[PDB]
């Protein structure tokens, strides 16, 4: 339930701090020992995604509210996209699912249970279909 | 259950196809 | 052992891009959705740790290969740490404990195991003491 | 045993202290 309550005291807030460089900088480095081949990829995913989040906002938060009054974990959740997968061959439910995971992730506050996700996840969403679409740009 | 985000996500998908596959 | 080799496969490209937009946007959001206090504490421990990081750089690398060669757990590591913090009651261990943890970040892959490392050592890392440097500057 | 990375850290630290205590 929102962010402002979980930085009560003094020690939360530099303690977040903290955590938050840690992060940053880890993600940064990672940036920067990466091929130029995976970099282009980031920019891909990027551009696609930054404009389906934004393109399709409302459609995110209505279907986090439709995740949220029912009781939904996230293991059940992978499966119904593996699911989808096997049949829907299309971009765009891929790129609609990390939008929408990307959404499920800026409301969570837990990193741990958060990556955990986003590993997960990324696993099914990056079938065989989903890479043929990536490689093929520019 | 659970598959109504299921759908929801494809639909939207459906929509993302559409867009790019034209002007 | 370095970074190109995790790489191996076109999917593992694409999943590493994928996975590092699910990680950078969770994180900018997250910074979006901070208070201007937390804004500024990482402001404050921003500069430090990056001139602690570039100033002692070698003397990273000394502590990291000594991390290595030896059977060191992340945990024992902590209780360390924590043991120093009794007595030590300086700015400067505090800082260089951050920027040492960040550079074993920079050099581990697996997000989880990185993730929980930050999560534990910070909570250690801040205590009573570091919370009182950082609260008293600008 | 792991107090060497210890001492080290503590070291440096103190070169970080005496550095900001002064000019």
């Known amino acids: ?138 | 259950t659970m598959g109504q985000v299921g759908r929801q996500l494809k639909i939207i998908g459906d929509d993302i196809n559409r867009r790019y596959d034209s002007q």
């Open chain 1, 1 to 138: 339930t929102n962010i402002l309550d979980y930085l009560s005291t003094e020690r939360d807030h530099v303690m977040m701090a903290v955590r938050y460089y840690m992060s940053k900088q880890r993600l940064d480095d990672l940036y920067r020992q990466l091929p130029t081949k995976t970099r282009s990829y980031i920019d891909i995913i990027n551009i696609y995604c930054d404009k389906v989040s934004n393109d399709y906002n409302r459609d995110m938060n209505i279907m986090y509210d439709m995740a949220s009054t029912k009781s939904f974990t996230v293991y059940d959740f992978n499966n119904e996209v593996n699911t989808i997968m096997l049949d829907n061959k299309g971009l765009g439910v891929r790129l609609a699912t990390i939008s929408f995971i990307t959404e499920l992730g800026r409301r969570c506050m837990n990193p741990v249970k958060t990556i955990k996700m986003f590993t997960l996840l990324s696993h099914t969403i990056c079938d065989d279909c989903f890479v043929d679409y990536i490689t093929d740009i520019s």
